[PDB]
Amino acid sequence: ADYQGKNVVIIGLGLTGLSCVDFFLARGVTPRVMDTRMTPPGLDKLPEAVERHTGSLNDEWLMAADLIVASPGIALAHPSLSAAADAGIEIVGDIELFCREAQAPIVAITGSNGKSTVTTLVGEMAKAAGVNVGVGGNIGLPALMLLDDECELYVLELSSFQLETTSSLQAVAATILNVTEDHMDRYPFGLQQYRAAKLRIYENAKVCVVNADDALTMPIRGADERCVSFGVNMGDYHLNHQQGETWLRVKGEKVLNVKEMKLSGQHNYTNALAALALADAAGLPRASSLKALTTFTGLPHRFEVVLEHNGVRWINDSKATNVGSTEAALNGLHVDGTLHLLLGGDGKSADFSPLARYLNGDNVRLYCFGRDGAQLAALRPEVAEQTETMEQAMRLLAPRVQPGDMVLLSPACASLDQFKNFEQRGNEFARLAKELGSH
Ligand SMILES: N#Cc1ccc(COc2ccc3cc(S(=O)(=O)N[C@H](CCC(=O)O)C(=O)O)ccc3c2)cc1
């Protein structure tokens, strides 16, 4: 692709938007930037020679554009963007720009849950092989910041939103890990429209890695010649359980006793399987890939023990931004005393009902907050309190905490109504836990 002399409009700043700005300037192209937010993140970082329009979209700029570069945080269905598409004006995102330039193979990962963990694992598998790997996308650095002629492999986490604006990805190995209800605020044609966005990841992929336990991860035409599967009891990559032990297996052969992993739990074992299938498809040596599985400690905010003190475990699962993720935390959860469960934020129009089956019995307490606090409290009103903020909920629950209890932030919602991102929510939980969890 060659952008010289084009009128380029970037919609949405933030770090993604900033990386797009830098991309064009380095190529001799001065883009214009707009954002519906008055003072979007990164505005103060925007170069002075870059024209900007904030507080609304500017239709004069949009209709004048030769290329529109849309942040994943703006819907293609926005009437302004829809009008531009109707006019035949080309719309792409940062991942599309990246794919057109990348000079190494790309492993591409998406799905409702597990995508950051699997992305990070594949990165570690590549690092263990002594491969110069760039890992990022929807996790870590925006993809464009990874572009380097000396990179030998890219491992990208791709959101459904990023995939909607991407057309030139030809992944060496691509997966949809699972599809459970999420982002319904952005998909008014429901679960299958959300699924369709993720299914794009398989277009022109050399190998497709599918979840044998989740039909929605299969291409519409069905699994094909390119399709490798992982699963619990079935799949090319699967689990073998015995007395008190679990093994990772590939086509019948044992490859790893999971006692050697630092991660635990079934969902992390299938994450390990998915990462191994991707790593194998990418040509990484099996031995170094297995070594990576034994060294990886997990990501922050992902069922992370932030304080274990006075017989109480305080767990930061702020990365649980949907119902499926909170389910993964609650399913098979052992608690000696009472579970003090923090739920809330922007629920993105999700049906929270599937959580109700995990909240029976006398040893559960719910502390519900943020935009959708009331809908979460309604799961079991008799054991629920509602506050405005997570801090209020923590100061409410802390006096009730007894030795043997668990305090679990696993909110099933986005943080964006009250926080910058789920990382900030997790960090604040950790700060408050340390204050409240000690005399
Ligand atoms: N014009 C314009 C314009 C452009 C961009 C924005 C930025 O807003 C977002 C940017 C990136 C986003 C990414 C996502 S996401 O869905 O990929 N990730 C969130 C993370 C939520 C959290 O961190 O708590 C989620 O899973 O719900 C959601 C909303 C996002 C909103 C506002 C206005």
UniProtKB/Swiss-Prot annotation:
Q: Care to name a GO molecular-function term for this sequence?
A: identical protein binding
Q: Which PANTHER family match?
A: UDP-N-ACETYLMURAMOYLALANINE--D-GLUTAMATE LIGASE (PTHR43692:SF1)
Role summary: Cell wall formation. Catalyzes the addition of glutamate to the nucleotide precursor UDP-N-acetylmuramoyl-L-alanine (UMA).
* Reactions catalysed according to its record: UDP-N-acetyl-alpha-D-muramoyl-L-alanine + D-glutamate + ATP = UDP-N-acetyl-alpha-D-muramoyl-L-alanyl-D-glutamate + ADP + phosphate + H(+)
One GO cellular component term of this record is: cytoplasm
Its primary localisation, in coarse terms, equals cytoplasm
Q: Which SUPFAM superfamilies match?
A: MurCD N-terminal domain, MurD-like peptide ligases, catalytic domain, MurD-like peptide ligases, peptide-binding domain
UniProt cofactor(s): Mg(2+)
Kindly list the places in or outside the cell where this protein is found, as annotated in its UniProt entry.
Cytoplasm
**Biological process according to GO:** cell division; cell wall organization; peptidoglycan biosynthetic process; regulation of cell shape
Which Pfam families does the UniProt entry name for this protein? Mur_ligase_C (PF02875), Mur_ligase_M (PF08245), MurD-like_N (PF21799)
**Which pathway does it serve?**
Cell wall biogenesis; peptidoglycan biosynthesis
Which superkingdom does the taxonomy of this entry point to?
Answer: Bacteria
Keyword Cell division listed: yes
Protein name, per record:
UDP-N-acetylmuramoylalanine--D-glutamate ligase
- What's the source species for this entry? Escherichia coli (strain K12)
Q: EC number(s) on record? A: 6.3.2.9
Question: What protein family does this chain belong to?
Answer: Belongs to the MurCDEF family.
Where ATP binds, per the record, is at 111-117
In what way does activity depend on pH?
Optimum pH is 9.0.
